[PDB]
Design a protein around this nucleic acid. Structure first.
Lengths: 477, 476
DNA sequence: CCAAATAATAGTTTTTAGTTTATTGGG
DNA sequence: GCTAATAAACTAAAAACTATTATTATGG
């Protein structure tokens, strides 16, 4: 939840270009910090700078919430220096300025990146201070200090420390840190009920929730640029010759009953309708996985179910999961979120993972939702019987694209084109457009930012492989 | 295929009573409710043959028209209820008589005229016949010949008549007069299992571009759609008439009415107030040309049901402007045994719309023993969740395993596909029909979705009682 | 500069994807 | 002595299904 990050760069002629990569990584990192809605207080320090703010360590920016102005100041006013100064003094100044920040407001985790030794050992390994050392590669005092830090971090972390070095090529070709966007979830305590005798407390979580938006689009006037000068007014004009206002109490919630509209009041509905009172999360029945088909997987929310947050309930749920798994038994659950919830029917099936075993639940449709559309079967339609040459062509096309790692038998097949791990490109496009607007409020038409295509498109070698079967199919037709 | 599915009801008002007539009324009853709640895009009529007070457009004798072909209405049911039950029966014999002459040719002619009077697009001409006799037309052979000729003429026209048995057993085929050209539904029209929506066309047609240029026409059908209540209509508390709403933008006590061009879109991040435009905002959501381009193929092993998205759809082979699309559909669909490597594509309905990656699962031809194709072969348009769709995840002896294995095996369910209905929707329907029709004191239906309490216990036995063998059950 | 026969855009009401609400628990 | 969120129907159009229109090409 809480994070504390500071910037310490070995900027100068030594980066002359890795300096450009470091600059753009810094810009995208601060953009992610701004757009991620984080409560981190960033601070910037400078070393070997003209003027004294007191050891040639001049402090530039204190701690505050990230914003567009800070990024613009970083982009503009921060330029490489031509002075040399001790970086140990810069580290000491950073620790001194972070001491009062820690005292005033407590944090949780510290993370530092880059693109005597006793003091470092004491300060870093004290409570939670940590950093990841990224290299621009793939003077001699700088090299020896770098090596010292290398042994410190591999001794502090171990094998994980050994494999925590990535080149800028691995930060640009592949993605190293680019997915700092996430939404928080609310836990739902509940109690699973089996008939009348059994009632076991459970914890329910929204496993797969549909994409939302943190903010909302605000309409402002082109001159006042504020919602306070906009008054949204909606009125009900009576169906008379002119405009005659009708107030809300004179409005009746009529319903189109066939060819007629019958008056009704929403309060009357509550008076003379009924809903499932309280929470009703109870099993309804059991059947086989064969009967259940993906064609009846309606709804949007995916509800993963764990044990209540006891352990006896946890092992009972695990045993039930195993019992449903080995027999391929699927249970029917009547779901009610709360007292006011709509009565829902769905199916929950066990979730198998090495770390833990979960019970994911999905909703099921009523017969009203299901619809029938009789069609003509094409597998026996002689008027559209496929040609065996077409069969050969499509067979040659099918095996052309093999996104899985079907090369080793001792190792499982792995996707060469992962899909489910790709976020919504629209949110990133919106963020980039907002950044363009902040930087260029006068320049219109933000660029389409084509580099989002590459991870959104199949691998180039896959396309080249596909080029041949598509070519031979095109000649076929 | 827009049009109307007409149906006319005619009953023996001169021979059933010279209860059987009451049963006909009850069977007719609630059919209007079923059509109202199912599909109002249809017309229904009721005409009685044999009466002292005849009424028809051609003014033939013993032909009485109560309701002509029109969409079912609450007033129609309310007025028909005057002739419901025994009191309704005696009212029927009072205000319009009974036991007059019958003329099958004349009633066929007048109902054909009624169908001719229809102005809407037509879909299906159906006639439902109620009579207590299998051969009540043992009269003059001239009338029989005329009736048979008229029946043949209307069948050639497309009018289809269906006659069903009644209180009279009617051994074997029976229908000694109607068997020449015409060859139960008491419960079907009496069970009144009324819950249905409309059916019209399908989803948008997409250009299946295999690589960059070859275009394949497709048709997307949605077999499952979430049910929703009919939209409320704002009425007037004094006259119950619809009120047209009006909304406009005001500039907070200056006088002018702000046009949509006058205002601008905005968002607030931190310190800055980023300003956009409506056209700009809608241009943000545009990514690419809508279409269906194939990403490749991904095996059905890197696809687990724990991750799920908006409900999948069905795509059907369509040939709208490209010839040979159906042939390619046939070629690809039969590749299902070897094509376990599901193909990949990104679904873009239209432009200015965010694209979604969607896998297509080859559906096979599920022909039934009744030689009826359910779920015709196609592709399941399963939506692939994105990275931001997953939230945080929080952190067994075999005897127990066998215990609830026996528990779940003793009590089960066959999982009928159509056996669960939303109680809110059906109870709302009951409320509407109660406050709009007879049974003016409201009634409530019963929902099968509620789990049993003792019937399930009996079918399971008392095993669960001694199956509380977990030490210190987690009950608080 | 009037001189008629024949495609094209667009009057209906249809499904569905951004919309706005009362109940959650943090000085 | 306490705003960490969500079961949101509203005023939602970003399908037009099938029905009059026109400009076109006119012609003798």
């Amino acid at each position: 939840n809480k994070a504390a990050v500071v910037l310490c760069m070995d900027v100068g002629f030594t980066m002359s270009s890795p300096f450009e990569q470091a600059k753009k990584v810094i810009t995208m990192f601060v953009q992610r910090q701004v757009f991620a809605e984080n409560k981190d207080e960033i601070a910037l320090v400078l070393f070997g700078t003209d003027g004294t703010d007191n050891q040639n360590i001049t402090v530039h920016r204190h701690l505050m919430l990230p914003d567009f102005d800070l990024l613009e100041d970083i982009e503009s006013k921060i330029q490489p220096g031509s002075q040399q100064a001790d970086f140990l003094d810069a580290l000491i100044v950073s620790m001194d300025v972070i001491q009062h920040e820690t005292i005033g407001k407590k944090f949780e985790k510290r993370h530092i990146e880059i693109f005597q030794l006793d003091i470092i050992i004491h300060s870093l390994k004290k409570c939670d201070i940590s950093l990841q050392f990224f290299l621009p590669f793939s003077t001699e005092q700088q090299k020896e200090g770098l090596e010292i830090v290398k042994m410190v971090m591999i001794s502090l972390e171990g094998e994980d420390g050994l494999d925590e070095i990535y080149s800028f090529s691995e930060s640009l070709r592949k993605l190293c840190v680019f997915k700092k966007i996430e939404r928080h979830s609310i836990h739902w305590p509940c109690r699973l009920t089996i008939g009348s005798n059994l009632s076991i407390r459970i914890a329910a979580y929204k496993s797969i929730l549909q994409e939302r938006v943190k903010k909302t689009w605000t309409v402002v006037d082109a001159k006042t640029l504020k919602k306070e000068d906009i008054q949204k007014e909606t009125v009900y004009c009576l169906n008379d010759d002119d405009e005659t206002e009708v107030l809300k109490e004179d409005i009746i919630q009529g319903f189109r009953y066939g060819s007629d509209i019958v008056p009704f009041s929403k309060v009357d509905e509550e008076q003379m309708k009924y809903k499932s009172e309280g929470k009703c999360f109870s099993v309804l029945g059991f059947c086989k996985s064969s009967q259940v088909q993906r064609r009846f997987f309606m709804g949007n929310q995916v509800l993963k179910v764990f044990a209540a947050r006891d352990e006896a309930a946890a092992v009972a749920l695990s045993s039930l999961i195993h019992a449903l798994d080995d027999l391929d038994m699927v249970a029917i659950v009547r779901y009610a979120y709360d007292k006011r919830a709509n009565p829902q029917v769905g199916v929950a099936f066990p979730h198998i993972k090495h770390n833990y075993e979960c019970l994911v639940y999905v909703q099921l449709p009523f017969m009203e939702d299901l619809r029938q559309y009789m069609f003509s079967s094409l597998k026996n339609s002689k008027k559209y019987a496929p040609t065996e040459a077409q069969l050969n062509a499509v067979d040659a096309l099918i095996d052309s694209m093999s996104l899985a790692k079907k090369d080793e038998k001792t190792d499982t097949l792995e996707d060469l084109f992962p899909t489910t791990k790709i976020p919504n490109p629209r949110f990133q496009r919106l963020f980039q457009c907002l950044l363009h607007r902040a930087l260029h409020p006068r320049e219109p038409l933000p660029p389409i930012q084509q580099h989002i295509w590459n991870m959104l498109n199949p691998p180039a070698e896959v396309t080249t492989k596909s080029q041949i079967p598509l070519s031979k199919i095109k000649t076929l037709f | 295929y827009s049009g109307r599915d007409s149906l006319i009801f005619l009953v023996d008002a001169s021979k059933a009573m010279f209860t059987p007539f009451d049963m006909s009324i009850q069977c007719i009853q609630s059919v209007y409710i079923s059509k109202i709640i199912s599909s109002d895009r249809d017309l229904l009529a009721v005409v009685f043959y044999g009466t002292e007070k005849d009424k028809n457009s051609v003014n033939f004798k013993n032909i009485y028209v109560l309701q002509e072909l029109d969409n079912p209405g609450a007033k129609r049911i309310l007025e028909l209820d005057q002739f419901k039950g025994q009191q309704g029966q005696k009212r029927f014999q009072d205000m319009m008589g009974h036991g007059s002459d019958y003329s099958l040719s004349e009633v066929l002619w007048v109902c054909a005229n009624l169908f001719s009077d229809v102005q809407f697009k037509m879909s299906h001409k159906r006639i439902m016949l109620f009579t207590n006799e299998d051969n009540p037309h043992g009269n003059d052979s001239a009338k029989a010949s005329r009736a048979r000729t008229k029946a043949g003429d209307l069948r050639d026209t497309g009018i289809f008549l269906d006659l069903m048995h009644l209180k009279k057993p009617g051994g074997f085929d029976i229908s000694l007069f109607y068997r020449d050209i015409i060859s139960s539904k008491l419960e079907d029209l009496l069970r009144k299992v009324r819950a249905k929506e409309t059916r019209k066309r399908a989803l948008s047609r997409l250009k299946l571009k295999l690589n960059k240029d070859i275009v394949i026409s497709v048709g997307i059908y949605n077999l499952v759609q979430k049910a929703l209540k009919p939209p409320p209509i704002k009425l007037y508390r004094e006259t119950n008439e619809p009120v047209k709403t009006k909304t406009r933008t005001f500039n907070t006590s200056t006088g002018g009415l702000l046009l949509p061009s006058d205002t601008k879109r905005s968002q607030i991040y931190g310190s800055r107030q980023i300003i956009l435009e409506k056209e700009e905002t809608e241009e943000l959501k545009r990514f690419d040309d809508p279409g269906l381009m194939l990403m490749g193929f991904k095996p059905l092993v890197l696809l687990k049901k724990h991750h799920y998205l908006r409900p999948s759809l069905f795509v059907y082979p369509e040939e709208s402007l490209v010839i040979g699309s159906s042939t390619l559909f046939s070629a690809l669909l039969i590749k299902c045994l070897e094509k376990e490597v599901a193909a990949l594509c990104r679904y873009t309905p239209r432009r200015n719309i965010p694209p979604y990656f969607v896998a297509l699962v080859p559906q096979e031809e599920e022909l039934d023993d009744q030689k009826i194709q359910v779920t015709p072969p196609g592709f399941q348009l399963v939506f692939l969740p994105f990275a931001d769709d997953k939230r945080k995840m929080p952190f067994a002896t075999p005897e127990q395993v066998g215990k609830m294995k026996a528990i779940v095996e003793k009590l089960r369910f066959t999982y009928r596909s159509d056996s669960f209905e939303n109680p809110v929707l059906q109870q709302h329907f009951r409320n509407l029909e109660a406050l709009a029709l007879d049974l003016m004191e409201p009634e409530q239906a019963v929902d099968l979705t509620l789990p049993k309490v003792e019937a399930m216990n009996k079918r399971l036995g008392s095993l669960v009682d001694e199956f509380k063998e977990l030490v210190y059950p987690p009950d608080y």
